[PDB]
Every structure is written in structure tokens, then in C-alpha cells.
């Protein structure tokens, strides 16, 4: 199986909306998807499992959706503390491409 992330980078300002794209090579159910927040020099953490169930302790601006083979993470109101690389990978984690979100 194969997974692909797009776009490769993003630089925006606060109070705005970001939209990412995570696409599998085949049809994947809505359960084996999770979203990550990797900051440099830190410990990464879970943001969203099963593509809609919000992880405990992360704010409500991180909202994900999608089905079949098209998956999307969306930050509703961008913040200056959201500078991190964001990862979508499967259950067995055998893929991963990376997408960096910068602050303008």
C-alpha cells in the first residue's frame, strides 16, 4: 500500500484556516488513520485517531475528516504555537511523508 501527503509546505498567519491532504493508494477504512504533531527537539503526540475521534487534551481547532482514500486535517483558527510538522500514517505505520506548517 502507498500513502502520499500534499502540499509539502505551508506558511500562513494567525486567525486563518489550513487544509491538508492525505491520500492512500487504495481504499482504506476510516479507522486506521491517525494524525501527529512533531515539533523539533520535542516528543511527538497524537492529535486524532480514527479520522474523527479527537484525542484527549488537544484543542478543538484541529478537526479532521475524509473517507475512502481522501483524508483531510483542518485547523480552524491558526495560532502561533502550531509550528510543527504534521504526519498522517496508517495502523502499521509503514508509510509517511511529512508536511511542515510555518508562521508568516
Amino acid at each position, epitope marked *: 500500500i502507498d500513502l502520499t501527503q500534499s502540499p509539502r509546505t505551508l506558511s500562513l498567519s494567525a486567525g486563518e484556516r489550513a487544509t491538508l491532504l492525505c491520500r492512500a493508494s487504495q481504499s482504506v477504512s476510516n479507522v486506521a488513520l491517525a494524525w501527529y504533531q512533531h515539533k523539533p527537539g520535542q516528543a*511527538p503526540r497524537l492529535l486524532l*485517531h480514527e479520522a474523527s475521534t479527537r*484525542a484527549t487534551g488537544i484543542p478543538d481547532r484541529f478537526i479532521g475528516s475524509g473517507s475512502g482514500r481522501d483524508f483531510t486535517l483542518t485547523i480552524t483558527s491558526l495560532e502561533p504555537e502550531d509550528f510543527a510538522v504534521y504526519y498522517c500514517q496508517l495502523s502499521g505505520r509503514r508509510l509517511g511523508q511529512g508536511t511542515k506548517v510555518e508562521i508568516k
Partner: nanobody, 130 residues
């Protein structure tokens, strides 16, 4: 609540055996899987493999299959990773985390609980030089 920490050497010459150790200090190894994740300094995150706490199941990366060995001790609260044929390309950062909610016990039922991946720990750096 569950706090875990990785450990290992810092300088590994080639043609050796890499060996790192992840220790849990917030609970048991029971009812969960245990995994390893690699990040090269230029690229992103890469998956190595994971093992079940009984030692009755393990899934591996097809690239790194025949040189890797993951083991876990239920009593000593630790997980050891071993890697053969150390190259300078293996200079990277290593991460240790427990896998999803499943406690799907057996060889006969089939290991079927694998959804998310909670705490990741700090990580370690392995540099390969002479």
C-alpha cells in the same frame, strides 16, 4: 500517567551490533504492543516494527527485516532492540512507543487491535562513525 524513556549508546563503529533499551515506569507491559520508529536527520519518520508483550507476534519493515530483533521482558519492564550490520546510513534518532488499544489475545484468534500510538518518549541519537 505512563512514563517511558529510551536509552542506549552514543557512538557505534561499523560492523557492530546496535542495541537500545526502552524502559517503562508507569505501569505494566500488559495488553499492549510495543514499537520502534526511526528518523534520519534529513528525512522524516520511518517505521521499524512492533512486537506483542507475550512475544507471540511481531510485524516488521520489509526493508529492515533480516537484520532486526525486538524483544520484551514482562517482569523487568523493558524492551530491547537489536540491529545488525551497522552502516553510517543508520545514524538517526530512535523512538519508542506503545501501540493501540487492543488486547487481542492469541495465535488462533489473530492479533487485531492496532489503532493509535501513545506516549513516544524523548528519543535517542545514534551516530555511526569510526
Amino acid at each position: 500517567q505512563v512514563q517511558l524513556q529510551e536509552s542506549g549508546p552514543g557512538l557505534v563503529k561499523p560492523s557492530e551490533t546496535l542495541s537500545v533499551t526502552c524502559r517503562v515506569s508507569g505501569g505494566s507491559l500488559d495488553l499492549y504492543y510495543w514499537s520502534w520508529i526511526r528518523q534520519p536527520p534529513g528525512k522524516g519518520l520511518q517505521w521499524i516494527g512492533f512486537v506483542y508483550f507475550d512475544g507471540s507476534y511481531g510485524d516488521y519493515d520489509p526493508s529492515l527485516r533480516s537484520r532486526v530483533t525486538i524483544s520484551a521482558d514482562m517482569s523487568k519492564n523493558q524492551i530491547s532492540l537489536r540491529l545488525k550490520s551497522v552502516t553510517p546510513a543508520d545514524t538517526a534518532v530512535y523512538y519508542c512507543a506503545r501501540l493501540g488499544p487492543g488486547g487481542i489475545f492469541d495465535r488462533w484468534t489473530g492479533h487485531y487491535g492496532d489503532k493509535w500510538l501513545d506516549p513516544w518518549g524523548q528519543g535517542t541519537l545514534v551516530t555511526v562513525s569510526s
